[PDB]
């Protein structure tokens, strides 16, 4: 499904910088702990595709950004 990577720390959606293939955001999405074969930045949002249903992601069970 879709998974807008968020700021694990405790802020809001996870932002990026240069559009296109991400550097650390690309390895954080293709990680074997996710199971995704796609992921880029929509303007400044690290979008991720492949996040299983057991992978928590925006929104958050606590923060309501």
Swiss-Prot record:
GO terms for biological process, alphabetical: defense response
Keyword Disulfide bond: yes
Keywords: Amidation, Disulfide bond, Ion channel impairing toxin, Neurotoxin, Secreted, Signal, Toxin, Voltage-gated sodium channel impairing toxin
Disulfide linkage: 12-65, 16-41, 25-46, 29-48
GO terms for MF: sodium channel inhibitor activity; toxin activity
Residues with Cysteine amide modification: 65
Domain LCN-type CS-alpha/beta: 1-65
UniProt KW Amino-acid biosynthesis keyword: no
Tissue expression profile of the protein: Expressed by the venom gland.
A Gene Ontology cellular-component term: extracellular region
Subcellular location per the Swiss-Prot or TrEMBL entry: Secreted
Superkingdom in the source lineage: Eukaryota
Primary localisation category: secreted
Domain notes: Has the structural arrangement of an alpha-helix connected to antiparallel beta-sheets by disulfide bonds (CS-alpha/beta).
Function: Beta toxins bind voltage-independently at site-4 of sodium channels (Nav) and shift the voltage of activation toward more negative potentials thereby affecting sodium channel activation and promoting spontaneous and repetitive firing. Induces immediate paralysis in crickets after injection, with a total paralysis occurring within 15-30 minutes and lasting for 1-2 hours. Is also lethal to vertebrate (chicks) when injected in very high dosages (more than 100 mg/kg).
Family recorded in the similarity comment: Belongs to the long (4 C-C) scorpion toxin superfamily. Sodium channel inhibitor family. Beta subfamily.
Name assigned to this protein: Toxin CsEv1
Species this protein is from: Centruroides sculpturatus
């Amino acid at each position: 499904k879709e998974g807008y990577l968020v700021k694990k720390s405790d802020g809001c959606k996870y932002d990026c910088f240069w559009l296109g293939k991400n550097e650390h955001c690309n390895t954080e999405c293709k990680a074997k702990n996710q199971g995704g074969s796609y992921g880029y930045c929509y303007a400044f949002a690290c979008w991720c595709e492949g996040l299983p249903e057991s992978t928590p992601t925006y929104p958050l069970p606590n923060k309501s950004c």
